[PDB]
Amino acid sequence: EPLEYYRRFLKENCRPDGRELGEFRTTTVNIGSISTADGSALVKLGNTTVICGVKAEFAAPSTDAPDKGYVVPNVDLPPLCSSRFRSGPPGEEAQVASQFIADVIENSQIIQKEDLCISPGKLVWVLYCDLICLDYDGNILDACTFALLAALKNVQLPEVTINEETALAEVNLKKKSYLNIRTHPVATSFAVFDDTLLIVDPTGEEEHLATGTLTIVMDEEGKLCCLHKPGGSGLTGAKLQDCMSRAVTRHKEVKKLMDEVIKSM
Amino acid sequence: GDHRRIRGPEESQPPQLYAADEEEAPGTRDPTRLRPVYARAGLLSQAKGSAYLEAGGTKVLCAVSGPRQAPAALRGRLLCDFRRAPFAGRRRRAPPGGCEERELALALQEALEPAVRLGRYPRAQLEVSALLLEDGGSALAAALTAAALALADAGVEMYDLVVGCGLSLAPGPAPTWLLDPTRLEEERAAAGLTVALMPVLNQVAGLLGSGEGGLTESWAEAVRLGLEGCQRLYPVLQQSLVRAARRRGAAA
C-alpha cells in the first residue's frame, strides 16, 4: 500500500525521510581524488552517488569545423548501482542521460570548442568525460551535471607545440593550463504527482510511483539551458515559475559549494 | 560506429606517446613491504552487499546483487563482471573491452567459487560486479579481496575469506621479488604474479603469473612471499567486517 502510505506524509507537508517538500539532501563533492585521470570529481546526494573522470586525447577534426575540440560524454549505470540494470550493453536510461549531458554541454556553452584547437585542420583535443553512477537512489541527472562541471573545472591540460622540421607536435607535461568555463549550469529536478504536487529531488520510490517528472537547468545569468519534461499529468506556467525560482536558489547553493571546494585545495 | 553511445571521433591517441623524456624510476625500497590499506564494507545502499578497497593509487568497488532465480546440478552459480573505468590508466579504452577484462573475470570466478559454498544457494546466480576506479598496481588482488568483502557482507555463506597479493620482478642484475608494487614498478618489470588464498585452511584459490623470464625456484619464492603478505593483510579485512556489522547493529 505504498502510494496511500505516501500521500499521508505528503498531506502533512513532509516526507517519510524528513524533508520539507522543497529541500534537497546532503550534497557533497570531492575533487582530484584520482591521478590516472586529467579531471576527477565525486558527487553524492546522501545515498545517491556519481563519479566523473575526464580524459584528454588528440584527434583530427571534421571538415565543417576544423577548430572544434570534441567533448564526448558517456554515462554508465552498471548493475552495481541498482538491480534494475543487468550486465551487458547500455540500456535506455543511460543513453537518455548521455544525450541530456551532451545537449547541456552544447547549449549552455560552458566551454568553447575553439579553445581546444592546437593546429587547425590537423589536431584538436577530445575530452572524454565518462560518468558512472554508483547508487541510483534517485535524481541522477543533477548529480551527473554537477560532477561533470566540477571535474571539468578541476581539469588542467598541458601545453603543446609544433616543430616544422619534424612536422610533429610535442607536449610539455610539466607546465599546464586550467580550462576556462563561462557558464555554470546547475540542474534541478522535480516529480509531479497527480495534478499539482511538485516534490524536489525525488528519490527512487518517489519517482517509481509518480505521474510525471521534470528537470530544469538554470544558468547563472538568469537563463535556461534545458527543460526536460518527459510526459506527465500536465502543468501550467504557475506551477513552473515556482520551479524556476527554486532552481535559481539551488544554483546559488551549489555554486557556493563548488567555490568553497576549489578554494580549499 | 556504435549506435548506443555518443558520436565521438574515429580514433584518438593520447599525448604521452608524443612526449620526450625518460620517465622517473622508483629506485629502492623494502622488498617485503605493504602499502597502507583502507578497506570498508557497507559503502553502497541499493546493493545487498558492497565493499571498497584502496591501496595506494588503487581504488576498487565491488557489489553483490544477491540470489536471483535462474546435488551437483541444482548447485548455485556466481557470475562476475570485472570492469575498469575508462578513466583509469595512462591510456583510455572504450567501456566494452574484450581482451583482459574477461580474463580477469575468469580469474575472479575461479578464485571465488572455492571459498563460496553454493550447495546452500541452489537454482540461484549471484551477480558480482567489480569496478576499478583507478589503477595503481596490484589490481586483480584488490578485486578478489573486495569481492570477498562484498560477499561476506551480503551474508552469503563461505568456508573462509579470500586474500590476494601481487608481486613483480626487479629487472636489475640481482633480480629480487617486489611485493605489492606500483604501476611504475609494474610497467618497468620483467615478471608479474598474483596469489590468492584462504588463510585459515591455508589453501590457494586462484593464482596467475607471467614473465619476461624466471625459473622454478624464483617462482616458488614469489609464491611463498605472496602467501606471507596475504597473511599479514587478513586482519585489516577482519576488522572492516566487524566494524560494518557493528554499524548495522547500531542502525537497529
Partner: peptide
C-alpha cells in the same frame, strides 16, 4: 600493514 583515510569515500 597500517591503514589510511579515504581520499574518495571519507566518513
Amino acid at each position: 600493514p597500517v591503514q589510511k583515510q579515504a581520499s574518495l569515500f571519507p566518513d
